[PDB]
């Protein structure tokens, strides 16, 4: 299990809201294309994270992480998502959620 | 056998991540050009303090090693190594590792 | 090679002479019982240290070294001698030179 922590920044890049929610270390939830068509960690998660902050739009936001330099990345993909853990050495993946 | 101690350092030159590696005493691992294509001990360090200290680029970082005077010189050459071994007496081998 | 720094001590264990010679890191100076009866390292040192401080006995004299913890130990055998070098990491072996 991972707990994946998200921080909400409204206009002046402050902390609106905090939320978590227990993730699972497996690669996707389902194998079959009717619940993986490509994606599954960055649609699992982004889809959390919609339903955890109502205060912005369902799919009408990106998420950014922090890298090796501390700069933000916009996230959207499960190749970044996989790359995105392999920074964290804990069980605690942070991520700074942004409504567009 | 040589053990090669490495002190990783941030912003402040403050010890993030201290870690250790078994060398040998021997030139280089390996004669042939498929594996010795001129480098071997300087190629051979920098690949384990890589996979030692991930916090950083694998190679994207130089090892300064201290002088007869204490100053820090960016090393990155076996010619450079057979020179940094001389200064110490003890079968230990103390380096600074920074990321570029 | 390896250089052995010796230290004379008098009454108020004050260093009264220092003098140097270089050693081989080989195990004995000769094979032949002619020449190599049982001894070696120990022989070779205590007699160098006899002809160095002639301020002293030529054969009435007890060098001891440091240990792990720092005391002194008289040693006086080439199985003491192998492992006082244990010790150093260097190339320079000091010792503490007393007349009996």
Known sequence: ???????LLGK???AREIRRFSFCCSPEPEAEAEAAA???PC?????R???LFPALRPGGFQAHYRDE???LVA???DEELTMAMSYVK???????????
Chains 1, 2, 3 share one sequence.
């Open 1 to 7: 299990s991972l707990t994946v922590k998200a921080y």
């Open 12 to 14: 002046e890049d402050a």
């Open 38 to 40: 490509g994606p599954g």
């Open 43 to 47: 649609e699992r998660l982004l889809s």
């Open 49 to 51: 994270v919609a339903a």
């Open 69 to 71: 330099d501390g700069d």
């Open 75 to 77: 996230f959207s993909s």
């Open 90 to 100: 804990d069980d605690i993946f942070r991520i700074y959620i942004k409504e567009k």
